[PDB]
């Protein structure tokens, strides 16, 4: 619907503008819907993005080892399997048709702006507990939804068709939802229905706000090859 | 063959007798082989094991954070849910066959022993690397995988006829083959071909020793309902 | 005065009885208080807490890691100061004084209830936040001062006189004193100033029982040479 | 000496050549050093460097938790306090004398060649084991070490001598040596005498070589207020 990823992303989403719409409205995915985007930095971003996953999937696996309840254990599960029983491979697969080796996709040198987010993620699950890991992960989750979405209803090209169609496709947006229900339970268990009542609570929109920020330097990057 | 999962396990399982022995031969491993436990300490030992299985799995699933390349992640990942979406569902099963109702299970007080075994598990990992967790966690894997081929070749009774096909099956036994050729591939990877000539060696031994251990301290818990 | 240690605390204490009790009032701390403790259960008290001390004091290095504002850092890093440049190197002079060589105390052999228990402060601090670990640690902390201002007042003998004043004495006090308003401000920050309407506040209880818990196996570890 | 911090630091320096010395001679190092860097680039690096320095002390702290033997844990507790009982408390002390409140230091927000920085290492920490950590810590720690001893030598104005002085003076070049014992130590004993022969070696000369590219991002950061 109007807010298709639970309570708490809405709400940390109002609280995250305008960097929210600097990430989701950014250039690069401008470019992507137009079929604008260049080739080099595509590809510049495909590689970039395969280091990002590595790191992205282990902190959704600390969000397995930061779980309480076997719910929450089996939806991390889910979303490490989501990322690296599937989209890791398919990403490898998507890499290799578009030109880049296996050997040289393992050199891969991680950009600046790529480790300061994946490494912003993992210390703040490492040092918080659930809420701060999953307030840090929300973005690249439900910003590449939303983004997928839109642009399945605007691209005016087919050029970048399959990143679209994996972003905006039911499987993608099924995955977002249900880390939008984690993400509600998991606030409500830990501090209650009430939860935007909790000193807590701007902590993890300034998490998200943070996460949102690195996303918009991840976007200026992958146009920065 | 004779040394089924792996050189590493071989050598460290070597260092830690007697205590290995202990934990394979134990009391409560005899009387699941003879069908002469009693049920009340099988039932026990099955609620308690469901408490000291969530925390194994935040184990497997910290040894995917602490992961350094795709496969030792994959390795991880694949123990993960042969936990998490596999093992602990049915363990549920099998306690709810056994009269275990869902709320009560949840209610489980978690006994010194198991605690002792699964946080000194954990805590090895988030201090360690990946070797001094996989050396913690090796003792449970392997050792179950070691009683399991035993007594489906001297079991006496199919009283226990369950678990004992469980950890002797094909299934249970190739997860294990998987662990120890992780256990080996992290070894050389960080110690070298001559790992057993690291100062790091003997560390890990006695990671895995203490893990054996607090395994005789389980199963001595089990018969102490 | 009443409630020597922070409001927190005295909530804690309070909803973890009758374990406190057993804990404060063990047959251990009346052979203290009244000189009857024999020798040798005292000596591998010393032994097995100079092991201890070493995990507790990595603990509170934790709680700076886990710490927000400098104000929590600080109490912290006092803390671990109190204990590694202070009640550390004072154990061991007290183990020296008792006849253990240096070597042998480095060789010491840690007693599953002693593993147990450090593990789970650890675990828990790795996986929780500042609150989760400053619940486990307080059992220990305002524990002892609990003891050692009751057997001040109460020893009939002075055969463990230096062991009484100094949990007894002011510094020890002091610190215990700092803990609480350190453990009272953190909660404040995190959870308000009606921290015991959180859902968190009844986990922060079962953690600190579950430590209360492990003190009382502790101090049975004592007694079983 | 020619290598004044231990055998550890001068063969990670030499593997991390060219950046090392695009570190330590720094467009920023030479401004400080002639005294024409603009006020306003130092004031603002002063107020990020106060929130570096936070996240720096919780990094040594993450040392202590890391640490095996009491050696590394002192040397560890060492650094923390040098940090956070000293470094700290004197530059809210310097940034307050160039007229930053501490309100306003307080809401300091991050910027992302920081927050790269100081997750990095963080990260590192938690993830690996105390090698990694130091590896990570080292360019910082001596890299100021080797700036502040070349400025003393060759400053031409002493409108930045207190920063020049605080890094060239005996207190911090035998913090930087204590360091580089710890580092040695730390090495020797977890890899052996041969420790550039251990695939680890790799590894962390990598994880040094990546920390002082990131300082070269801080020190651009600087000059971008
Ligand atoms: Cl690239
Ligand atoms: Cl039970
Ligand atoms: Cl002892
Ligand atoms: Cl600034």
Known sequence: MSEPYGKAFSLMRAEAEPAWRAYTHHAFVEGLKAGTLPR???????????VFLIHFSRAWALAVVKSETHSEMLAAVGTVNALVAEEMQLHIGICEASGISQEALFATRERAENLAYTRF??????????????????????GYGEIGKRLTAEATSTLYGDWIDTYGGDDYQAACKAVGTLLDDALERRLGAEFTSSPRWSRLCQT?????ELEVGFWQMGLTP
Chains 1, 2, 3, 4 share one sequence.
């Open 40 to 50: 080099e930095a595509f590809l510049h971003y495909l590689q970039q993005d395969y």
């Open 121 to 142: 993620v993992l210390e703040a699950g490492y040092s918080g507990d659930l809420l701060d890991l999953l307030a840090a992960l929300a973005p690249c989750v439900m």
């Open 208 to 212: 998200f706000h943070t996460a949102t």
